[PDB]
Amino acid sequence: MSQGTLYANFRIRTWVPRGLVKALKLDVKVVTPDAAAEQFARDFPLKKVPAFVGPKGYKLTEAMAINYYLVKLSQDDKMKTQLLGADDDLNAQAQIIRWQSLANSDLCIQIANTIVPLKGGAPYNKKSVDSAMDAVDKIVDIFENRLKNYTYLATENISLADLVAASIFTRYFESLFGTEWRAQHPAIVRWFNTVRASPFLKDEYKDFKFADKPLSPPQ
Length: 219
Hints:
The chain is mainly alpha-helical. Helices cover 53% and strands 5% of the residues. The protein contains 10 helices and 4 strands. A 4-stranded mixed beta sheet has the order 2-1-3-4, covered by helices on one side. Strand 1, helix 1 and strand 2 (29-31) form a beta-alpha-beta unit. Helix 1 (12-24) packs across helix 8 and helix 5 packs parallel to helix 8. It starts with a strand and ends in a 22-residue tail after the last helix. This is Elongation factor 1-gamma 1.
């Protein structure tokens, strides 16, 4: 466990970091707060996750940050260049960050304006939720349009972008993207499955419920 410890439970924001450790074979210890909170609190008094701790007492939080950090810890140059793009390949690095952003922002935003409300986890509002969905459809189209002539989002390899964007899409495929949806958004589906299958996410998508019943309003 020389390379550090990654305090992470099983929340979507933890999936990639966890997968990264496995797939990149990082010498990083993965633990859940419950598995050792006497240490989690001492290292992260804010008891927030994902939380990473490397030697010399380095601390770091926020998924994105940890994801990037972990990737760089890897010694597999080909992998690093594949996930974040080559140093001499700026065009790619940027593009990866582009989608890395559309997903992490543009699409992930609406979850708290749709999934949360519908799943009855916050005050429901037809006018609102229905307006949030429109946002979702706007982003969803950005994706589909690209996935239609391209295998992956920012390159011709699964990149850190695809990984993250895949994790975000998850909750949507469980509460909002049903049969009729998947029928009109093939590319997204195609792409989604290929990304889940990877060693990066495979173990996180064990029992995955592909909803076919777009959660309807309260009651």
